[PDB]
Design a protein around this ligand. Structure first.
Ligand SMILES: NCc1c[nH]c2nc(N)[nH]c(=O)c12
Ligand SMILES: [Mg+2]
Lengths: 544, 50, 1316
RNA sequence: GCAGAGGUUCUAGCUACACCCUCUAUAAAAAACUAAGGACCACACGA
DNA sequence: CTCTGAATCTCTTCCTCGTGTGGTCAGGACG
DNA sequence: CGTCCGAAGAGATTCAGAG
């Protein structure tokens, strides 16, 4: 248990415990020699003190007040230090045991995957599953001894890959992130062999993991026993974890690209090619959009068969001519039978998609919900790629009244300063009034910016122009809910706002420049204040 | 698996019990920890069997 | 006018504001600091002379012997930088100190000495600093980061809040010295001053005052006022002053000379106070009630006998007053106590004070400092005196003295280094005044109270420590040693002083390993300032307040560049214009405004002096005369941005980029992105692994020509001239005659470093960039280094970027990469490793390197040469043999599993006294042939200059050149050249040559001797062999590839070219990013940058089209002139009429791949200018084009953004991340996974994952991950046999770690057993 | 190693959990069997 | 006048994994 | 060849002053 075997350049000397034991033994031997030699009482007592100190250091070094040391003046590790703390054999080797049959790599999207499987590099799988390969190679007669199977494996012959494709068919693996706070951190997954060097993760399950694609690393463990393989199928597979343990809300929620694709798919334009046509069905809508005779979002009249489960376990068909766009009609094919049609007739932002998934899970069973989620993700990706939604400088529209609002706010500030000079108001009153008028100016600027972005588009509706919800890429990315709230849009076109001083006092002069325009040096410093404060807060938030 | 023992010439007290939160041996004898600390390290005399 | 470097590719500049100050030499802080550590300083101030003079009196105690230091002289390094790097030694210069030992006569202080012993003694070796600023310590490069620590001096604090849980303010004061113990005065909640020395237990503050030979009366009169009461028949009438009356209510009828002003119990109103001053009466009638609760100020003894009636600081009761009145004490001095203004803080401390005189105070201090020791009078006196007044222990530095005097509001600057009595009493007085209300606390985070300790100060301190240790040694040696026998060399050893310096330079918290990942990475590391280290905040200890950015960081410390993570804000980067003051505080240049004109004189302003002055902003339009056109100019007076007039402002900023650091300034359009994405993008330019073919940044800031030249990555010309012979490894430049030195001059050989290992395992290659005949001028970069193109920092490549979602492959942060990127080898980086094999003397004889390994195949030995080393050029892979180490009875080094590549070179280091092996002999033979070749080549071109010099001058004089050439030209002494001013030099040179050839032959023998001699090695080793492997990694799915602004993300899929989106003209894009990352993460700079890159590439393509079809140079000239102007009052104003036909042609070729555009950080290009730039080509002015799709061929509606963004590959590759191991060697605890990638390891199933498993119904997998998978000696083999047989069962067993725990607890004297 | 002895090989190979074969004085005819040292401290970086 | 509530004095703890770099110790004669 | 040579709270404490 105390090794003393570094064997580096013949040194053979690395035991902190061994040094302490030698100290104790030497003190005891000297005490025995003095006792048999009838030494003076003071010397015997001094040696007794030394022995007591040595025993104290051996049991718990550093408890008396001094620490036995000498290795670069660093305290020695006693027996007590090997049990307590975060490094003793109680929290480092008994609870968190390192395991075999494990791997580690970076993550990749791989949207082609289903919900219950994930990518796994071939070179990683050939080492994770080596014993199974040996066993099957011996069983099939390809090799005779374990050495022959070993050589066949290192040669990476063509037969080895075919064998590996058999021992990987229904063998779940436990993909696991590093900070697994909740139980959804470690989830099972069926392996799909790829040729890269990164474990691909299904995009939908990148939210429960808190998974990220800026170089985040995951660990791949391999269940081995039959009970483990059954459990990593009936208790931990991604299909069985739909609702979060804490709150009864869905955990597979479309996050960024699929929601934008569905939002762009299910909208309306006041005048697009192919308006007023009476479409036969969703098949005809798909044929018409693919051909090009019509557009994705154009109000038409298409008959749609809505299946309702009002009767107990019976699906009643209701065919009617519902007034809806081409894009909504195309999406109807994805939706299963049970759900009604009103779910896919709205703008279909993000809460709408989450509610659609939840209603599918309620009315239908869990089995159709997985397929619905997969089809939704595929359709969203495809029709977001087809959209070509891109951000440009011309998209960030600065409200035209900004300069007037700023000038009027500065005039009010000057008036308040004049009142302060005359002694009518106090310093604190002046400060509060300035803060209030600047806040009012900020509110007006934000309102003007929104009014110039949300409904700016005016389109010719077969005659007089008609106002329509805008198709601005920033507005499409903010209204749907893909990425970015209203405040972040405000910071890009309107004034940044009243930034705060490190202590907490709101600085009188606000940043009257957006990010589209130039930011002054002083304004950038004031922004740096808050940015640094936030980063420093998070750095210790994690540990707490 | 096997261990060994060292025969101490003079008796030695266990620091885990002497110097802890409640001072086990101090509590048992109802003596302040300071006096026990002094006598244990050969500083003062406690007169057993008065 | 531009230099020939700038005439090849002149960068279009969009800066609008004129500059006055040029960017200073970036590595000045380190270089100047180390310069003031070895430069001979005659006065003996900072440096080495200062320390030597400080600790060299060396007078033995009554030993009639003195050792004096007279001078020091640094030696000459044995090996140069290249030799030190290759061999593995420290770049050091031996220190030769000339001492003198004078032997006084026996007990003759008034007498003289018998003899002197002036002689030189070698005293350690100090490492030297390479010109770049790196230290060669053990063959590697180490950089000592500067330290930012709280300045020595007094610092009043508040410490309000948590203490006392009642909001009471516990004012304190710490006198922090530069070397000693911290004196800390602290106020108690009950208003009791308590001195706390060295942060030990609390002592009453009166004890310190008593310890200074101060009696009670002295303290009372020092820290209090005095109200005088006089014995009078008129109710003991006392003197009074109206000023003291203000503040509190009067409790008695204030009257004097039969005139009543105030009544009894009447509050003294303002009018009452004014009429009281108007009355101006000294003595005011008082009753006995007022004097009832009065504290006396001095002791009063009776006159009849002499006994004390009352003591000092005693409450005078009525009986006491009567007794002192009848005793005859006319004067009654009671201390004044204004409860509002002057509190009784000192009196209460005196009440709690347990001592009475100096002896008791010293005894108490000795007891506190040294518990368990008998308090001795002499011992206590010595301890207290040394601790607060001795030159040996307490040393307040000059900066400390200045800070102390400024904080105490004194007048003189230079004082002393020992805390005096007046200093202590003044600190106490100011603390009391602060407690009263007058004064304010001092903000610690203020940059005027934190100073920079660079390399020089730390080296001086360590050398001082070593010198005082050797002084301690020599002091004892001198006394008992025999006199007039031993030399100074005997009493001084080198080890005890060399150990400190070597330890500081080699192993310290500030001697960090240099990271040569980039030319920018090296510059950032040298200029970094870190709080952590000796005398600095630890990461855990540091609070949120330290991590914040103070308002006084403007121009002194970068507000953006800070390592995110644990130490956020603790290691900040120096600004681009900052420069340390004389004392050590930071400074920032400013322009002086006298009346209304901005004078060009720049005065560097300290942090403190910045406050009073009102400083304007750089973004203030001038009028070409110095007057601000705007009547109201924004300013920054005292941490408060405001709007002042032109008649008040007296200082202005020098440049718009003086706030940001070097790294953050390189980011273009930084004025647009957030302060968080800029933070995360500034830390991502220092991890860009250099690519294969350097590509200039299409759009850059303008500082790309400073980080490259200032760093040592590129070889800059030392003397101007014309290139003679340029090769792929060497460049020889013949200097111009004016630059040429008169004798032994003519050629300046530059040797370029070929592929060599870096500190982070990359390639450091230097490619020539000049041609034969090109006129090279002083300061021109003639050879680029890693990540450098034509002397311009090029960390990555510019690719065609299109922002659009593509089938979900560009998810949250993923990026699509076309196969054109991989095919052209745009990001293929070279990586070099270094495997080593050491042969050491062993039991039963030493090991040998012979290729005689037992039990190995001929194929294994095929790579090995007859001697036993692999050929240079063999393509070895994993498992192959590299050396042939044979140990006395097959321990030869093998390529680690996974590592591949080709061997570039092999080094065989041998020890002295051991014969070199045949292969060593063959490298040494080639090196000595080539070392001989180098001396011969140097001699030949030296004769090209010398014999040419012997010529150029031989022809002038009338002597026939043919006659001179017929005889040997070198020895033309026979043909007497006509005497001239160069003939004497030539004759001297020819005489030298009939002699220099012999001297050069000795020098060649000496040069060859260094190569031939075996290098000093570690004790016990015979010879070591180092083999370098070089791989060429390419782009793989998973490799992180980020931009400059902050957009990061791994590569998702290498899509084929045909499937990538293609625009109308047919050219496919190369990267398809995700647009959804811009709206939330407000890095809107990466869109503007894209537009500007597209415009630049458009102009480049137009120029290329003009070049493809042969066109007249006039058309190219006019088009390039049009592009260079673009209006908007651009600063550059480049003119092409001063150029030549060939010059314009060269420029056209160099700009055919895009026109580089400069964009200063905070004064860059506006949107209108970018639109004009785009319209100058033919690209759409909006910036978005109709991008068709590859697969379907259909058109993408809603046109997308296409441009050119500068993408750089991060070095967090994926080949160094994948690691899967089924089984591996066990640990001491018997747990199978050791961990890590180097040794086959398993990922740790931490407590968090165990809890996550427990949350599910997981019970069998937990058992099989805790027992049969990690540590069960009887379970792992059983399960392996079961698995290779077919049935996947499991035997639980019991973990070995549990048995280890049981044994550890049982060894502790506690019996723990597993009961049944 | 049936017990003793020797053993092809596919490091080493009656124990590490081991295992098998042939042979009768001592090595030589043959296939099937299995994974060995990791003590501490500073510095940097990523999610 | 003896233990109220009120200080006073030591003690324990402070995310979780990777990727890595460098430095690394008891105590030299001695019979 | 050995052989000797910051902070934040908690426990773990006293000190105490009044009714
Ligand atoms: N470990 C036993 C052993 C050594 N050599 C061997 N040769 C053979 N054929 N069989 C074996 O079992 C052995
Ligand atoms: Mg991430």
């Amino acid at each position: 248990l105390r090794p003393l075997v570094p064997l580096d350049g013949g040194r053979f000397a690395t035991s902190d415990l061994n040094d302490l034991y030698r100290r104790v033994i030497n003190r005891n031997n000297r005490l025995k020699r003095l006792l048999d030699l009838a030494a003076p009482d003071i010397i015997v007592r001094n040696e007794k003190r030394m022995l007591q100190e040595a025993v104290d250091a051996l049991l718990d070094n550093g408890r008396r007040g001094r620490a036995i040391t000498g290795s670069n003046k660093r305290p020695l590790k006693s027996l007590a230090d090997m049990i307590k703390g975060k490094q003793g054999r109680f929290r480092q080797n008994l609870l968190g045991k390192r395991v075999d049959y494990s791997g580690r790599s970076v993550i990749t999207v791989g949207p082609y995957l289903r919900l219950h499987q994930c990518g796994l590099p071939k070179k990683m799988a050939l080492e994770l599953f080596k014993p199974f390969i040996y066993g099957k190679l011996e069983l099939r007669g390809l090799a005779t001894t374990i050495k022959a199977a070993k050589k066949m494996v290192e040669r990476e012959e063509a037969v080895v890959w075919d064998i590996l494709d058999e021992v990987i068919r229904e063998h779940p693996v436990l993909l696991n992130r590093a900070p697994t706070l909740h139980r959804l951190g470690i989830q099972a997954f069926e392996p799909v062999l790829i040729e890269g060097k990164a474990i691909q993760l299904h995009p939908l399950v990148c939210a429960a993991y808190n998974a990220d694609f800026d170089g985040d690393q995951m660990a791949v463990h391999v269940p081995l026993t039959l009970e483990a393989q059954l459990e990593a199928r009936a208790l931990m597979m991604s299909t069985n974890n739909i609702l979060s343990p804490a709150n009864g809300e869905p955990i597979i929620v479309p996050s960024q690209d699929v929601v934008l694709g569905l939002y762009y798919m299910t909208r309306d334009c006041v005048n697009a090619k192919g308006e007023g046509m009476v479409l036969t069905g969703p098949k005809e809508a798909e044929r018409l959009y693919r051909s090009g005779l019509a557009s994705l979002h154009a109000r038409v009249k298409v008959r749609i068969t809505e299946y309702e489960k009002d009767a107990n376990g019976e699906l009643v068909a209701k065919t009617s001519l519902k007034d809806t766009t081409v894009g909504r009609a195309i999406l109807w094919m994805i939706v299963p039978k049970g759900l009604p049609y009103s779910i896919v007739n709205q703008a279909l932002g993000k809460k709408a998609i989450s509610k659609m998934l939840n209603t599918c899970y309620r009315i239908l069973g869990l089995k159709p919900t997985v397929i619905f989620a997969d089809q939704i993700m595929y359709t969203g990706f495809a029709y977001a790629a087809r959209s070509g939604a891109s951000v440009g400088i011309d998209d960030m529209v600065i409200p035209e009244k900004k300069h007037e609002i700023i000038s009027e706010a500065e005039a009010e500030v000057a008036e308040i300063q004049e009142q302060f000079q005359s002694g009518l108001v106090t310093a604190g009153e002046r400060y509060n009034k300035v803060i209030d008028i600047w806040a009012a100016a900020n509110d007006r600027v934000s309102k003007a910016m929104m009014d110039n972005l949300q409904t700016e588009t005016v389109i010719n509706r077969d005659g007089q122009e008609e106002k329509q919800v805008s198709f601005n890429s920033i507005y499409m990315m903010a209204d749907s809910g893909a990425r970015g709230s209203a405040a972040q849009i405000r910071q890009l076109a309107g004034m940044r706002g009243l930034m705060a001083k490190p202590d907490g006092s709101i600085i009188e002069t606000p940043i009257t420049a957006n990010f589209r325009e130039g930011l002054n040096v002083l304004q950038y410093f004031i922004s740096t204040h808050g940015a640094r404060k936030g980063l420093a807060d998070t750095a210790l938030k994690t540990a707490n | 698996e096997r261990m060994g023992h060292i025969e101490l010439a003079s008796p030695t007290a266990h620091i885990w019990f002497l110097k802890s939160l409640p001072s086990r041996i101090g509590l048992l004898l109802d003596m302040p920890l300071r006096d026990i600390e002094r006598v244990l390290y050969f500083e003062s005399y406690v007169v057993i069997e008065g | 006018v531009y230099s020939y470097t700038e005439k090849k590719r002149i960068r279009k500049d969009f800066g609008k504001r004129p500059q006055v100050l040029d960017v200073p030499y970036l590595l000045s802080i380190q270089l100047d600091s180390f310069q003031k550590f070895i430069e001979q300083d005659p006065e003996g101030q900072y440096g080495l002379e200062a320390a030597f003079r400080s600790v060299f009196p060396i007078q033995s105690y009554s030993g009639n012997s003195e050792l004096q230091y007279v001078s020091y002289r640094l030696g000459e390094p044995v090996f140069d930088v290249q030799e030190c790097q290759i061999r593995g030694v420290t770049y050091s210069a031996p220190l030769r100190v000339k001492l003198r030992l004078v032997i006084y006569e026996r007990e003759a202080p008034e007498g003289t000495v018998k003899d002197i012993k002036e002689q030189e003694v070698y005293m350690g070796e100090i490492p030297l600093m390479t010109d770049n600023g790196t230290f060669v310590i053990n063959g590697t490069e180490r950089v000592i980061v500067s330290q930012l620590h709280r300045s020595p001096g007094v610092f009043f604090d508040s410490d309000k809040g948590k203490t006392h849980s009642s909001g009471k303010v516990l004012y304190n004061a710490r006198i922090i010295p530069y070397r000693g113990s911290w004196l800390d005065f602290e106020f108690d909640p009950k208003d009791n001053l308590f001195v706390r020395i060295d942060r030990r237990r609390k002592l009453p503050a009166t004890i310190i005052l008593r310890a200074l030979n101060y009696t009670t009366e002295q303290i009372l009169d020092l820290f209090f006022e005095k109200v005088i009461f006089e014995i009078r028949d008129n109710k003991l009438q006392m003197e009074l002053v109206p000023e003291r009356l203000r503040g509190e209510t009067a409790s008695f009828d204030i009257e004097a000379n039969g005139k009543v002003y105030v009544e009894k119990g009447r509050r003294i109103t303002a009018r009452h106070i004014r009429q009281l001053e108007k009355d101006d009466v000294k003595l005011i009638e008082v009753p006995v009630e007022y004097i009832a609760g009065k504290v006396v100020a001095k002791d009063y003894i009776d006159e009849s006998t002499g006994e004390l009636i009352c003591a000092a600081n005693m409450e005078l009761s009525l009986d006491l007053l009567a007794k002192l009145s009848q005793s005859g004490h006319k004067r009654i001095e009671t201390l004044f106590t204004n409860d509002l203004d002057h509190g009784p803080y000192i009196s209460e401390t005196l009440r709690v004070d347990p001592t009475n005189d100096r002896l008791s105070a010293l005894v108490e201090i000795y007891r506190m400092m040294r518990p368990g020791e008998p308090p001795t009078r002499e011992a206590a006196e010595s301890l207290f005196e040394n601790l607060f007044f001795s030159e040996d222990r307490y040393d307040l530095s000059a900066v400390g003295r200045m800070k102390f005097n400024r904080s105490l509001l004194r007048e003189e600057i230079e004082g002393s280094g020992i805390l005096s009595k007046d200093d202590i009493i003044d600190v106490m007085k100011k603390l009391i005044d602060i407690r009263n209300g007058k004064g304010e606390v001092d903000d610690i985070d203020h940059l005027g109270n934190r100073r920079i300790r660079s390399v020089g100060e730390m080296a001086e301190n360590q050398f001082r420590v070593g010198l005082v240790r050797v002084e301690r040694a020599v002091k004892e040696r001198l006394s008992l040693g025999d006199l007039d026998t031993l030399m100074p060399q005997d009493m001084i050893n080198a080890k005890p002083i060399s150990a400190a310096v070597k330890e500081f330079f080699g192993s310290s918290q500030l001697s960090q390993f240099m990271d040569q990942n980039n030319p920018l990475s090296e510059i950032t590391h040298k200029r970094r300032i870190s709080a952590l280290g000796p005398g600095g905040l630890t990461r855990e200890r540091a609070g949120f307040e330290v991590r914040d950015v103070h308002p006084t960081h403007y121009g002194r410390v970068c507000p953006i560049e800070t390592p995110e993570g644990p130490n956020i804000g603790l290691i900040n980067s120096l600004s681009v214009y900052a420069q340390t003051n004389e004392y050590g505080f930071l400074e920032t240049p400013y322009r002086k405004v006298t009346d209304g004109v901005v004078t060009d004189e720049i005065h560097y302003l300290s942090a403190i002096e910045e406050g009073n002055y009102v400083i304007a902003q750089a973004n203030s339009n001038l009028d070409e005369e110095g007057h601000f056109v705007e009547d109201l100019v924004t300013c920054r007076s005292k941490g408060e941005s405001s709007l002042f007039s032109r008649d008040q402002v007296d200082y202005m900023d020098v440049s718009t980029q003086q706030v940001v650091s070097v790294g953050a300034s390189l980011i273009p359009f930084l004025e647009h992105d957030d302060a968080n994405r800029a933070l995360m993008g500034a830390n991502m330019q220092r991890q860009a692994v250099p690519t294969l073919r350097a590509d200039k940044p299409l759009v850059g800031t303008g500082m790309e020509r400073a980080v490259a030249v200032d760093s040592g990555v590129t070889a800059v010309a030392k003397r101007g001239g014309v290139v003679q012979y340029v090769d792929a490894s060497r460049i020889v430049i013949k200097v111009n005659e004016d630059e040429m030195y008169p004798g032994e001059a003519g050629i300046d050989i530059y040797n370029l470093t070929k592929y060599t290992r870096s500190n982070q395992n990359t390639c450091i290659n230097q490619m020539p960039c000049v041609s034969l005949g090109e006129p090279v001028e002083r300061g021109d970069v003639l050879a680029d280094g890693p990540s450098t193109d034509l002397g311009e920092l090029a960390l990555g490549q510019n690719m065609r970027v299109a922002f659009m979602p593509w089938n979900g492959y560009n998810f949250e942060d993923s990026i699509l990469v076309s196969e054109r990127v991989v095919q052209e080898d745009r990001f293929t980086t070279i990586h070099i490793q270094e495997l080593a094999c050491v042969s050491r003397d062993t039991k039963l004889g030493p090991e040998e390197i012979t290729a005689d390994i037992p039990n190995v195949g001929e194929a294994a030995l095929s790579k090995l040469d007859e001697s036993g080393i692999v050929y240079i050029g063999a393509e070895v892979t994993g498992g192959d043999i590299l050396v042939g180490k044979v140990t006395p009875k097959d321990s030869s080094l093998r390529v680690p599993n996974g590592v591949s590549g080709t061997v570039i070179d092999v080094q065989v280091f041998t020890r002295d006294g051991v014969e070199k092996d045949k292969r060593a002999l063959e490298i040494e033979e080639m090196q000595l042939k080539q070392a001989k070749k180098d001396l011969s080549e140097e001699l030949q071109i030296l004769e090209a200059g010398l014999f040419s010099r012997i010529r150029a001058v031989l022809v002038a004089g009338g002597v026939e050149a043919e006659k001179l050439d017929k005889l040997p030209r070198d020895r033309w002494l026979e043909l007497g050249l006509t005497d001239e001013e160069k003939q004497n030099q030539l004759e001297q040179l020819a005489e030298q040559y009939d002699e220099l050839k012999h001297e050069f032959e000795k020098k060649l023998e000496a040069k060859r001797r260094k190569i031939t001699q075996g290098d000093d090695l570690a004790p016990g080793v015979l010879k070591i062999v180092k083999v370098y492997l070089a791989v060429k990694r390419r782009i793989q799915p998973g490799d992180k590839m980020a931009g400059r602004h902050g957009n990061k993300g791994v590569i998702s899929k290498i899509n084929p070219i045909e499937d990538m989106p293609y625009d109308e003209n047919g050219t496919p894009v190369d990267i398809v990013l995700n647009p959804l990352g811009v709206p939330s993460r407000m890095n809107i700079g990466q869109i503007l940058e894209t537009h500007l890159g597209m415009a630049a590439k458009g102009i480049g393509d137009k120029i290329n089209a003009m070049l493809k079809q042969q066109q007249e140079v006039a058309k190219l000239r006019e088009f390039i002139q049009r592009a260079y102007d673009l209006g908007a009052d651009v600063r550059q104003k480049v003119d092409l009429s001063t150029f030549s036909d060939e010059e314009v042609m060269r420029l056209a070729e160099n700009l055919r791949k895009g026109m580089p555009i400069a964009t200063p950080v905070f004064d860059g290009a506006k949107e209108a200018e970018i639109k004009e730039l785009l319209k100058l080509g033919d690209l759409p002015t909006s910036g978005q084009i109709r991008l068709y799709d590859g697969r379907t061929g259909e058109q993408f509606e809603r046109p997308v953004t296409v441009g050119y963004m500068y993408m750089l590959k991060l070095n967090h590759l994926v080949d160094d991340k994948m690691h899967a191991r089924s089984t591996g060697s066990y640990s001491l605890v018997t747990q199978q996974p050791l961990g890590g990638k180097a040794q086959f390891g398993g990922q740790r199933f931490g407590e968090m994952e165990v809890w996550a498993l427990e949350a599910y119904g997981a019970a069998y997998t937990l058992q099989e991950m805790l027992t049969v998978k990690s540590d069960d000696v009887n379970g792992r083999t059983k399960m392996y046999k079961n698995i290779v047989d077919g049935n996947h069962q499991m035997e639980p067993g019991m973990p070995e770690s549990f048995n280890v725990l049981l044994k550890e607890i049982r060894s502790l004297g506690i019996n723990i057993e597993l009961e049944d």
